[PDB]
Amino acid sequence: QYVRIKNWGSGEILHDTLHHKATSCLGSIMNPKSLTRGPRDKPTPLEELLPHAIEFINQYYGSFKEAKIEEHLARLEAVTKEIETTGTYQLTLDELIFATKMAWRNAPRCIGRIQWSNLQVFDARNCSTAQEMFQHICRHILYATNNGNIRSAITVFPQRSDGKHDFRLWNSQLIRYAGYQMPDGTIRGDAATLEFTQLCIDLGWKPRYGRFDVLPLVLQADGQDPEVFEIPPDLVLEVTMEHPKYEWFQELGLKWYALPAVANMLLEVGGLEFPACPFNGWYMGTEIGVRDFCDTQRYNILEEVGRRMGLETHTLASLWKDRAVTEINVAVLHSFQKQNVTIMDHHTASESFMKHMQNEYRARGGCPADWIWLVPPVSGSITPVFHQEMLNYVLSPFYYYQIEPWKTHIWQN
């Protein structure tokens, strides 16, 4: 029937009846196969496609407040015919829009899903060349950045056909800093982008060897070899880090890009796959201040910000790490607010999600949620999300992870 869910904070109880629509689970594994949709070298078998397709069409037409039965049956038949004759099918623009928001809505790891309906969709399904991808991406970056007043958007490239003509962005995020392996063993820049940075170099990119060198777009169109394009600097909006009290903060010369755009995920809908569909939202403080700046495997500025604060950086029990990270976080939020760039603190975000989750259970009795990802990287139990029991299931439409392209790509030249 349903699964009982309790929020140990307010005490409220919820009944999940939505998980029954799940498809095909191991603790805290970051990249489980169940969340990945790999490559193919043959079209999607009709016996599988037709059912998913029909299923989707029913959902779309089942969303309207004022039912349009006639159109529904019509679309169903037309869709079927199209599959029989073509061996696949094209979604209507209206359907695609509905698909992107649903997939976002069904993203267990996203904390900003309250915005699920506010999303701009760029139809780049008629694209065909790398240069054309690059243009669409730039238009996206420019639209999303909106001079600091960030707007959520997604650019949908041509769906996978046979599997040998896949449109793919080799980057993890559109805007991302480079990571260089310095001469003297030490790393410089974003250590997380080490391997990919090398690739960019192997493809003739000019390594400017700096702390914040924006990586080039490595695009792949219609199954062809990837072409490298440098993002126009005028497009990449950044925020300089300043602390509202510690004037020595800016002396650290820190900064981060204001555009959080996922680039390497696949959009699944009605049996159709979209290997390239970069999407963006706006940042949440802790992402930059806690993960990007404080993770040891990233910029690791924690021990440095410690000394400058005059803390006992050699006595763990002094809770110096807790004190520091909070000021680094204050910096991020402050710097963004000052420079008029959209951003949301984790606390405000958490409440927002609770409101969303609550709205979801009413509207459809459920909300797929990965607790491990939803609870912020600092002050967990301080946020309401921590005390909320959640069920994590894969619905459809969905945004899947993909196998890194450079591992499965069969080179031409």
Add this chain to the structure above:
Amino acid sequence: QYVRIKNWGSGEILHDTLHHKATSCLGSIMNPKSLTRGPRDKPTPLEELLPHAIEFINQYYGSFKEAKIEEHLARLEAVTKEIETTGTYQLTLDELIFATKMAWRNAPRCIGRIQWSNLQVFDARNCSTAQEMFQHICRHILYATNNGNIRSAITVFPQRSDGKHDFRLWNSQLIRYAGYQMPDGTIRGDAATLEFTQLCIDLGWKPRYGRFDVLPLVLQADGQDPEVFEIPPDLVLEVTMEHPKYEWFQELGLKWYALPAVANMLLEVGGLEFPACPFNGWYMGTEIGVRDFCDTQRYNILEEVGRRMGLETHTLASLWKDRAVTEINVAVLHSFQKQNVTIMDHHTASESFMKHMQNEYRARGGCPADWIWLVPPVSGSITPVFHQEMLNYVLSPFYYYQIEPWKTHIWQN
């Protein structure tokens, strides 16, 4: 074969081959049935008991560095005979000790398992009356408290026989503060102990209506009705809260008990069940400072500590909550350190667990771990535990949860 585990912090990889020994899973559910071992009204069937028993005996004798084959086969036969003739079996003191440490070792939610071998065991298997339980408990509390130099210990009461003669402590923890539903709608004390507090009252306990009134021990022996006993005040060691800078802190009149003792869990071993086996360790800062003091459903002192600090307690984005909780945490650790009471900060604890987990994979290729419980309630990603992928599985021996006794107890008088 094995399951690959990655620590995104250091990059290290681990191979889990221990999960194969698991027994009979839903996101962030706090009390899943898979973790609970309920009541019985009939003995444990021999067909099930004998295999588990044999299995356990093999483990125990399989731990010795210098194998004692003779004794092993002997114990096996003697154990079997004892089961055939008695319909159950008694563990040797040495075996019980081994069982308690293994069960602790196999506690997915415990972060202090590095201490798994340092545990004192009190054999109270020959107990028979409530008053006798009360005496054993006091001896435990006194031994564990050790004038602030906390010692880990466990008192094992008589194992379940038929199921109608169960030894049970109705308390969640040995030392626990009372929670009263005040006249003017407001709660007072520990809101979490509301329902149980009432029960104590229903049994004639004298409600002193205060913020920190230590609850009475509600003991149940040999399946009989529960008898109430008040813990001798001289036994309950407490710490007064003081901040190393804010002299106004002690003006809050806060304090907490120095003894973290689980009282209502069941010990499973070789097919045997121990419905009453209270155990204790020493506190970890965040337990008190973050959960006990800051949770809205507990003492909720966050908004209060905020004002006194002169923070913008009405502007979430100001990160006042983050600033406060850290000072409340500083207080706890400080107050404990000053008053010479054993305690460990979460950071030091996290590293400790990493060392343990690492030692476990070498010693036996695995370590059952509930990430959701292991990662501290504040500064998650700041601790190494956050970046460590973990597998959560139920081994044996194990410490299970039990159904609250007052719900399944058939009263006499």
